[PDB]
Chains A and B, each alone.
Chain A
């Protein structure tokens, strides 16, 4: 139902991590060790794909990585965090509303079909020690644009490649809506400067790889606030900066941007995801909150992840758990209660971008 993707550089990080464990240079963090502890095979007996899937399976439905993660092995190690932040996941979705936050959402008369690509932003906040992403992209406390570009390129390019080819297979082009990934909770102390850095990173990826993306057409970048409206031709692509908090009446994230429609385009929305969380994060705890939780709640994301058939609620703009679950219950009925009760795990097929820019198996 969903597809996990990662870069060639991340695949190298995983192979090195496995080898590092087998050579005794590292020990698994508690939550990885917990998933590993359920296995009959040791680490040296696993192949790279199983190993990767079990590290991804250590994610929890809801985690607040900017505040309640310690990066010291009592939950995850930095070595695991460097991998998990690079993992993205896509899935087909029904979009029941336009993705407006809070009470601002507008329901679609007939729900539209499209795709989500969950991608974790740079984790530039922490409750405890420095994060992997802080070490990667900060030079003595200062944001390095080229390093941030490289990070987002590593994380986003596999999804752009995936939907370039899927638009081709569907004989359409792709329209992609993108939020201000990493500019909210994950921005930490960089809240006040991060907005143009993320915009610049998106422009650099598209310009650098434009010749690999002939079926990508329109990019709708909506940072919400902190950026100015703009439109830029990037190769063949139309890249629009459209902050819906400063311009009124703009298209939502879960809606066709101007110039696209269901006949000519597939609609894909990027979700600002989270290193240690299942897709949707906040909404597993019933909160239709943040880009991640809003987009999950406003789609059938939870059905694609759990395999269950939920019910959309027009009043609260929300895909709810199945009636066969909520009906008898006197309490504790949100999607995370559904996963605890049914032993659901987050484990799916994984592909990696290879030397030639093709998605393929990890071996």
Chain B
């Protein structure tokens, strides 16, 4: 259990996450906290978009990492 940062274009969301959480899981936590549907969430880490079905661990996202949310 750890925390990461999701920056918007801005209002930084702090999330409580596990290395094993899938990206969809993370996107769902963003929805709970911001009301943005997962279908309209694009998440970027280290310059690459994060895909459904992989975990934060898979991308080597560790404690206090910053993610970037792209929104309309």
Contact = CB atoms under 8 A, between A and B. Distances in A.
Interface in B5-44: 9, 22, 24, 37, 39-40, 42
B13 to A, nearest CB: 17
Contact of B72 (A101, A102, A125, A183): A125
A110 B71 CA distance: 39
Nearest to B37: A191
Contacts of A64: 42, 70
B40 A289 contact: no
Interface residues of A, number: 24
A286 B71 CA distance: 20
Contact of A102 (B49, B53, B71): B53
- Give the secondary structure class of A's interface: loop
A348 interface: no
A185 B39 contact: yes
A155 interface: no
A183 B24 CA distance: 18
Given A185-B42, A187-B40, A191-B39, A67 B70 contact: yes
Interface string A57-69: 0000000101110
Nearest to A283: B51
B40 A287 contact: no
A102 B22 contact: yes
A101 B53 contact: yes
B53 A67 contact: no
Interface string B37-72: 101101000001111110000000000000000111
Nearest to A68: B70
Given A67-B72, A126-B72, A289 B49 contact: yes
A287 B49 contact: yes
Given A184-B39, A191-B40, A287 B48 contact: yes
B51 A66 contact: no
Contact of B40 (A103, A127, A185, A288): A185
A302 to B, nearest CB: 16
Nearest to A334: B48
Contacts of B72: 66-67, 125-127, 188
B46 to A, nearest CB: 11
A104 interface: yes
A292 interface: no
Nearest to B39: A184
Nearest to A180: B39
B24 A67 contact: no
Interface string A133-177: 000000000000000000000000000000000000000000000
Nearest to B52: A102
A185 B49 CA distance: 14
B37 A67 contact: no
Interface of B: 9, 22, 24, 37, 39-40, 42, 48-53, 70-72
25 contacts: A64-B42, A64-B70, A66-B40, A66-B72, A67-B9, A67-B70, A68-B70, A102-B53, A103-B22, A103-B53, A126-B72, A184-B39, A184-B40, A185-B39, A187-B40, A191-B37, A282-B49, A285-B49, A286-B48, A287-B48, A287-B49, A287-B51, A288-B52, A289-B49, A289-B51
Interface of A: 64, 66-68, 101-104, 125-127, 183-185, 187-188, 191, 282, 285-289, 293
Given A64-B70, A285-B49, A286-B49, 5 more contacts: A67-B42, A101-B53, A125-B40, A126-B72, A188-B72
